[PDB]
Amino acid sequence: SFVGLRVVAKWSSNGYFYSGKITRDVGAGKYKLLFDDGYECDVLGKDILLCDPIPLDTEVTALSEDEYFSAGVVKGHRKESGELYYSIEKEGQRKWYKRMAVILSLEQGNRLREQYGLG
């Protein structure tokens, strides 16, 4: 089953997909998911993208202090001490981001919906 797999799930209002993990399967096509910040709730399957990790060359939004819409492209993955890091390219330069800092806007997530969506 999908229980225990890491994913990115849309978040109601802003429609952004945040890194999380499916903790239980429920009815009504919903899933109990736990976001990396500790918040747990039920979301619909159509709002979940089975991505661990976000694939290379995906356009994403990389979070940094006082930056909320900074777009970039995934160009690398790296495992270190049981933690995933993303190499994000922007304006010809690459920077390292931790997993939870990499999110997808509605448009960015829609591009993966067909292949990785649980709809």
Add this chain to the structure above:
Amino acid sequence: NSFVGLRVVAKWSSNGYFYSGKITRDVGAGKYKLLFDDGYECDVLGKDILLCDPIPLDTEVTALSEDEYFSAGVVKGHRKESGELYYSIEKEGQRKWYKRMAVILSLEQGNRLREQYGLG
């Protein structure tokens, strides 16, 4: 004066943690519109907002890491690097660095700051 634009740690959900964020509006009725570092926006009661930027030294906090949601630690240092704040969290005699967005407070941990920094 005006708390608009000031960074805070605020609890938006019932029985949730205090997360790093920013005040964006005074919406009256003892509420404030907040912008969490992850981009989520919502109104939050003043009593649920801790006006401290950064979190004071020697504060017990929770430091987030992949697959760890309850790791406790104490703040022992602050550092700015490329306009970003980093916390030095001490746990079991060793110190590790965490970005601002990764340092959160539990209800018990946040309660230790209400009297001094709470907007209630």
